[PDB]
Write a protein that binds this ligand. Structure first.
Ligand SMILES: Nc1ncnc2c1ncn2[C@@H]1O[C@H](COP(=O)(O)OP(=O)(O)OP(O)(O)=S)[C@@H](O)[C@H]1O
Ligand SMILES: Nc1ncnc2c1ncn2[C@@H]1O[C@H](COP(=O)(O)OP(=O)(O)OP(O)(O)=S)[C@@H](O)[C@H]1O
Ligand SMILES: [Mg+2]
Ligand SMILES: [Mg+2]
Lengths: 131, 333, 333
DNA sequence: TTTTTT
């Protein structure tokens, strides 16, 4: 199984993404053993905010591709791609602490991202491949 | 020798062009006062800061879009009320047929002076806007929900009939015919847009706006407004927390964001924006949940600070002048 | 000087617009009596209070959605019966093909004067709605189960064919073609929707409506109805406890919610609403499990108090009048 | 250009 590679996602900032991606877009396709849906795609990480301290896994350093499946539900404690305001994206782990949704990073140096009503989950991060 | 001949030829060509087309047909960009950018307040100080030049530009096309009940009509009516306070004449093209005159009055709009038109067709709406712009007596025109700008053929047609790009072509022709007229008459045309879903977008922005592609090119400012939370007085929801992102800007830097509260029956919370901007500009001290101005504890929480600044007009005006001097990148003359 | 010229130009352009498009094409919003919001009862007093304006606005689009057996059809038929009691003519577009005329007669609907259509396709249903709105002789239209508005191309094809955004496109076109007609004829169109599943919902329920996004933008009032319990006469379940949330309101403040009982065969328990509202407005004294009015003990338990109010019409009228005076923020007459 | 669907 091989899936498209679409741009990058900022790990801990909710950075804007200018450009829109269709299935016909992208000239990079990366294969893996993970059996995701046909809407799944690869996102490559720029940012060290989701790099876990050594000895604890999983970790997502800058440059590694993460497979995102929008057709799989994200539960608290899972890793997801979140969209803020329709244009901004982030890659963080999802926890619903005290009835308010938060995106917390694997790097303590970076702060927890509060989520508002304009926030939604793009998909679930289900695989990781170095390019 | 060579340069003097070039100057003579250029002067002759310029004189010929002025004789053919008029006095202001061609001239140097530096000595063209008609091309100066003039702005008006949007009713939100944070949005005035985010727009860079201090508000929406006169003589341009502005697009505001977002999801349902994101505050597009309220922001529009706050702009209209701010313009009407300055003696300007405004017009509301209510293509959605969903304007409440009483609520518009409650937002500060001079309803007795607001020209209101509920056009049958999209062509009628755009022709009314064109006539109002050509008049030179209307300063702000708002077209609510260009998604409701239905072409005459589609209205005369049946449900399910296909009219491929007919509204898009009509909006393209409207932009072509309206840009110059709006620039000449210094009229601000604000287009309100609804959001539709792009089918087949695996990553990125999944939304488009209605009406095609012409509005994206011709708009000098494009605002993406969204509801990011609720304002509650304990149990009742009394307002909404609103974010505005400047996705396009031809008069300043884009992608700046503005946060404010829209209170139901009052509109944009100007005083709360003043509180936040004073807090950011080191004018109001925030110790945890305690807001203090120059040592005097003004209240606890945003609501109490807003109420106190409402109760003390002198200090509110002082903080407002300080914030306008400091934060405004392009303070208007 | 220039102000007189501006006034002259404004008058001339306005006269030109009226000449081109009609006498009511453009005018000041203050003197526009066609923009006044008029409402009709929803059959539930708590809902009329929660709606702020006293009911569903005439000439607008209203969406009522919720889970199965939540009371959408019953509430819509109570709206129809209340409208028909005021001499209005109503139509019911039964797209789901599951309307029981005997139950409608039980709820109080005049079956003989109710126009009913069981359309084959969604295009036919929306064309019938457009024709009824353009006629001007129908005051209330109901489209049962927007989810059942099947496109003609979807009906003609076989099961398994993918019609991507066909229903959403059809509903967007219908909203475009119907908003103006409904506003012109002052016809209330109520769309009943089903609830469907949704991915990625950070806040609120993981639910969505059918038919696309246009109905979210075009509806003046959107109602979320849910069944929050059961009403039992001993061991028999005789009704349902229902909560209606105003998730969208264009004529008053949104997010207010109402609670009432839908009793099978009778509809909305108006007298139970009267009991609860008189209790909350200190009109009916609540002493633990005992209810009293003006010192006189009226009964114990909500059911027995409601039975008492049925037994005594005069005190019912008095409590209703006082509650309507105290709580309705927009009285018309 | 147009528009989600489970
Ligand atoms: N008459 C009113 N009274 C009180 N609150 C209102 C009224 N009209 C609108 N609101 C609220 O004000 C907020 C902003 O509303 P709008 O300005 O109409 O936004 P909108 O983008 O125009 O939404 P649309 O046009 O229905 S898609 C929302 O929370 C509305 O519920
Ligand atoms: N003919 C009937 N006689 C008695 N009770 C009924 C009858 N029809 C419906 N009910 C009950 O009335 C309540 C509301 O019914 P409806 O108005 O049909 O709900 P609904 O929102 O339309 O849900 P749907 O259309 O079935 S998905 C439910 O508790 C039903 O069991
Ligand atoms: Mg609006
Ligand atoms: Mg039903």
């Amino acid at each position: 199984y091989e899936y498209p590679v679409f741009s990058h996602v900022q790990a801990g900032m909710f950075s804007p993404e200018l450009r829109t991606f269709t299935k016909g877009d992208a000239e990079r396709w990366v294969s893996t053993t993970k059996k995701a849906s046909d809407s799944a795609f690869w996102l490559e990480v720029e940012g060290n905010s989701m790099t876990a301290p050594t000895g604890s896994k999983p970790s997502f350093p800058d440059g590694m591709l993460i497979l995102v499946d929008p057709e799989q539900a994200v539960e608290p404690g899972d890793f997801c791609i979140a969209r803020l305001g329709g244009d901004e994206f982030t890659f963080a782990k999802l926890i619903r602490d005290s009835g308010q949704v938060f995106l917390q990073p694997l790097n303590p140096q970076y702060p927890m991202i509060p989520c508002n009503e304009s926030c939604s989950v793009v998909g679930k991060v289900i695989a990781s491949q170095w390019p | 020798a060579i340069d003097e001949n070039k100057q003579k030829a250029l002067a002759a060509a310029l004189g010929q062009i002025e004789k053919q087309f008029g006095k202001g047909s061609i001239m140097r960009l530096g000595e063209d006062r008609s091309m100066d950018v003039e702005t008006i307040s949007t009713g939100s100080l944070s949005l005035d800061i985010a727009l860079g030049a201090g508000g929406l530009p006169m003589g341009r096309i502005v697009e505001i879009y977002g999801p349902e009940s994101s505050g597009k009509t309220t922001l529009t009516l706050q702009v209209i009320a701010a313009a009407q306070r300055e003696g300007k004449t405004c017009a509301f093209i209510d293509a959605e047929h969903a304007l409440d005159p009483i609520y518009a009055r409650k937002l500060g709009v001079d309803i007795d002076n607001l020209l209101c038109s509920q056009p049958d067709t999209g062509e009628q709406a755009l022709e009314i806007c064109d006539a109002l712009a050509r008049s030179g007596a209307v300063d702000v025109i708002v077209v609510d929900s260009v998604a409701a700008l239905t072409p005459k053929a589609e209205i005369e047609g049946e449900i399910g009939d296909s009219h491929m790009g007919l509204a898009a072509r009509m909006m393209s022709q409207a932009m072509r015919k309206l840009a110059g007229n709006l620039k000449q008459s210094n009229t601000l045309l604000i287009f309100i847009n609804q959001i539709r879903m792009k089918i087949g977008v695996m990553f990125g922005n999944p939304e488009t706006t209605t009406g095609g592609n012409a509005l994206k090119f011709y708009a000098s400012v494009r605002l993406d407004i969204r509801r990011i939370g609720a304002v509650k007085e304990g149990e009742n929801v009394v307002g909404s927390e609103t974010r505005v992102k400047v996705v396009k800007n031809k008069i300043a830097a884009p992608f700046k964001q503005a946060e404010f509260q829209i209170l139901y029956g009052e509109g944009i919370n100007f005083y709360g924006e003043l509180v936040d901007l004073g807090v950011k500009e080191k004018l109001i001290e925030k110790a945890g949940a305690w807001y203090s101005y120059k040592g005097e504890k003004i209240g606890q929480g945003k609501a109490n600070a807003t109420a106190w600044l409402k109760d003390n007009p002198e200090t509110a005006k002082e903080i407002e002048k300080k914030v306008r001097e400091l934060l405004l990148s392009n303070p208007n003359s």
